[model samples]
Target: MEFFGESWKKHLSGEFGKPYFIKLMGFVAEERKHYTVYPPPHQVFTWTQMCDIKDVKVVILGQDPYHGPNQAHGLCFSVQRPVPPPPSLVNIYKELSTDIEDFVHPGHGDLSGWAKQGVLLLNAVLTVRAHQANSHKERGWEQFTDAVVSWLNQNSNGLVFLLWGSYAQKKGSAIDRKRHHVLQTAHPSPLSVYRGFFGCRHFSKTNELLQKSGKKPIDWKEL
Candidate 1:
């Protein structure tokens, strides 16, 4: 599958360095059937966009796509069906938009300001084929983690990694522990929402950390 774009092609062609084991990973991807075959949209807000921004302070990493059709949106764990927003996000939205008349944007109901402040909302696996469960033991997972770690190392500027569950936490752990500050929390799914999603004090704590550290705040809030 041709998931990586021209930049990847140039790297694979030895323009960067002598090809390594990771470079051979591109061929392995071509033989894999479960991976998403198509590349992300050229205009999708992504790592490339985050790189262009001057003041990125937070990086929220999710597992993979939750739905098939709207995979282009780049928000992991978002289903394509017209279901109500996830309760975790819904509650947070309510809290953020307490004025009742300010929830207009769909990109984010009330947390749009966070987006403007260069919160790089990202997923570990940009896409996965429908009906595939993400397994860390798989080769695809290895490639994904390597790419992400490389990206994180290159863009460590004032950024905090938001690891939302055991899976995401493990992925972040693969990075050098001392290089970045990684905050681990329960996943925002209904299963773990009650612990931190609905009305957790983590929001205030995260905000305070940002204020103290001069980084952007990223945490669960109840709407």
Candidate 2:
């Protein structure tokens, strides 16, 4: 299937239907270049990658990307081999795995176990180049977010959105305010890691929510 559904044809034909979006895409591209990073197009999440299936219990939403070295291996800020993972992800993953060692591994497996259970592990910006700073208010991202909202509304089932930070939470405001259960928390930035991501509160909150909602909890104890 096409990436944009019927909108793909229109977007290619200079008939984007929304002038603001066209302009926004242009601005995003420019900003990407200005920041010396590739835009989302270079690393977009494919339609197949975003499919919602059965048994998905949780959805984790991350910001753009880590502008640090050897990070962002095209899997939404995930680390590649020969390089250590970012401190934020490392700490969070450690905490999660420690909390839920019975069900999941911290670093050696697909982080999308929730996706296998029909959860959608989505990033708000979807794509950003390595070593590039991201703008929280990218206009192109706003347009892309519109598409994400439509998808979520159409598949509003037993899905919970994990908005990890201010950026993720703000990006979600344009979507249906009443559709899903959104959990907002501090970003897992190294600066803010001490506040929540490394602590037990996040894991506890997640487990509590999952148990209360009756979904199989992943290995969150390690988090």
The regions of model 2 sitting more than 4 angstroms off are: 1-43, 46-56, 67-70, 101-115, 135-139, 173-179, 200-223
153 Cα displacement, candidate 1 (Å): 4.6
Tell me the number of clashing residue pairs for each predicted model.
8, 18
> Candidate 2 at 84: error in angstroms?
2.5
lDDT of 2 by residue, 42-146 (tens): 334432243333444565666665555544433443554555556666666666655554634445422333444444555556445455456544646556655
Name the candidate that leads on lDDT.
2
Cα lDDT of model 1 by residue, 1-223, tens digit:
2323344344333322434435534543553454553224442324434233445566666665443343334444343234445555555454445423344325433333454465656666554444454432354544654565566556565456667767777777765546655666777666775565444434454466566776655534321
Off by over 4 Å in 1: 1-40, 43-45, 50-54, 77-84, 91-116, 131-142, 150-158, 174-179, 215-223
lDDT of each: 0.50, 0.53
> How does model 2 score by TM-score?
0.63
